[PDB]
Design a protein around this nucleic acid. Structure first.
Ligand SMILES: [Zn+2]
Length: 273
DNA sequence: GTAGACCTGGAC
DNA sequence: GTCCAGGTCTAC
C-alpha cells in the first residue's frame, strides 16, 4: 500500500471505528509491535482509550486516541477490517483491537512485515518512523524546488530518489514507475542528470498520478482492497507497472521490465528517455 | 548502490 | 521447485 491505498483505507475505516472505546488488545505476532517494544505495555496503555480520529502521513496510518497516537505501517500485505468479536478470525490476523460495543478492529498481514508504534500524540511526529518523512505530495510543501533540491545533490537513480520517503512521502514501486513514464524519464538515470524542465514535469506527473489514484480508490494489482474488502480501480489506468511484454499505451512499443534500486522496474524504452 | 533480511502464499 | 511481491532496513 502506497499513499492512495493507505488513504482509501483511511477514509473507509474511520467511520467504522470513530467513537469506539478500546476494551482489549490481543497480539498474536509480537514482532509487529515496535514501540513500546514490550507488547504487553503496548496493549495495556491503549485499553480505555477512545478512537477520536484517523489520519495519514505518507504511507502510515495515524490512529488518534485520547492520549496516544497509534502509528501503523501496512508494508506489503497489512490490511484492516472491522467485524464482530463473536466471529472466528480470518487467517493471518496478528493483532486485534476489541471495542466495548462488541465489535473489533482486525489487522491481517500474511508476510508479517507491518509495524505498529504508539506514542503520546505530541511525540509521534518527532520520533520514528514519522520523524524524517518528506512532505506530502498533494500539499504545497511538495514542489519542483523540493525535488530539485534533493535531485541535484545525488548520483543515484531518479527512481531510488522517488522511493525515498525522506524526499517525498507516499510513492512506491507502482507510482514511481507510472510517474516517470508519464514524465517521459527513464527510471535508471541519475537524478542529478535531470534538467529543470524534466524535474518540473516529473513533479507535475507525480502530483497528478497520486491524485488520480486516490480518486480511483488505489490500485489492486495483487492483494489490495479497501476496508470494505473492495478493490480499487486505478490498475486499469496503469501505463507501465505490471505491463511488461504488453504494448505501450502511447506508442505501442512493448513495455519492459528490469531491476533498478533492487526492485522490479517497468518502463517504455521509447517514451522514456 | 545492492544482496540479504523478514515471511508467506501464488503463478509457472 | 524457482521466482515474485503496493516496503524498508542493513551489512559487504
Ligand atoms: Zn511508449
Amino acid at each position: 500500500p502506497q499513499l492512495p491505498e493507505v488513504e482509501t483505507i483511511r477514509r473507509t475505516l474511520l467511520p467504522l471505528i470513530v467513537g469506539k472505546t478500546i476494551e482489549d488488545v490481543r497480539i498474536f505476532w509480537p514482532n509487529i509491535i515496535r514501540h513500546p517494544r514490550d507488547s504487553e505495555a503496548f496493549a495495556a496503555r491503549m485499553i480505555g482509550q477512545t478512537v477520536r480520529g484517523l489520519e495519514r502521513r505518507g504511507k502510515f496510518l495515524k490512529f488518534l486516541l485520547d492520549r496516544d497516537a497509534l502509528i501503523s505501517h501496512l508494508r506489503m500485505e497489512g490490511r484492516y477490517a472491522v467485524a464482530s468479536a463473536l466471529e472466528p478470525l480470518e487467517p493471518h490476523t496478528h493483532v486485534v483491537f476489541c471495542f466495548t460495543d462488541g465489535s473489533e478492529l482486525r489487522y491481517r498481514d500474511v508476510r508479517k512485515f507491518g509495524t505498529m508504534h504508539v506514542y503520546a500524540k505530541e511525540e509521534a511526529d518527532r520520533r520514528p518512523p514519522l520523524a524524517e518523512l518528506g512532505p506530502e505530495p498533494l500539499s504545497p510543501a511538495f514542489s519542483p524546488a523540493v525535488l530539485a533540491e534533493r535531485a541535484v545533490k545525488t548520483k543515484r537513480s531518479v527512481k531510488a530518489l522517488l522511493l525515498d520517503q525522506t524526499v517525498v512521502a507516499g510513492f512506491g514501486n507502482i507510482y514511481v514507475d507510472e510517474s516517470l513514464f508519464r514524465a517521459g524519464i527513464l527510471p535508471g538515470r541519475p537524478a542529478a542528470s535531470l534538467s529543470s524542465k524534466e524535474i518540473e514535469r516529473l513533479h507535475e506527473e507525480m502530483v497528478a498520478t497520486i491524485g488520480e489514484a486516490v480518486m480511483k480508490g488505489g490500485s489492486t494489482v495483487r492483494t489490495y482492497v479497501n476496508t470494505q474488502g473492495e478493490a480499487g480501480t486505478f490498475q486499469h489506468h496503469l501505463y507501465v507497472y505490471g505491463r511488461q511484454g504488453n504494448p505501450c499505451k502511447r506508442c505501442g512499443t512493448p513495455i519492459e521490465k528490469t531491476v533498478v534500486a533492487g526492485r522490479g522496474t517497468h518502463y517504455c524504452p521509447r517514451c522514456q528517455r
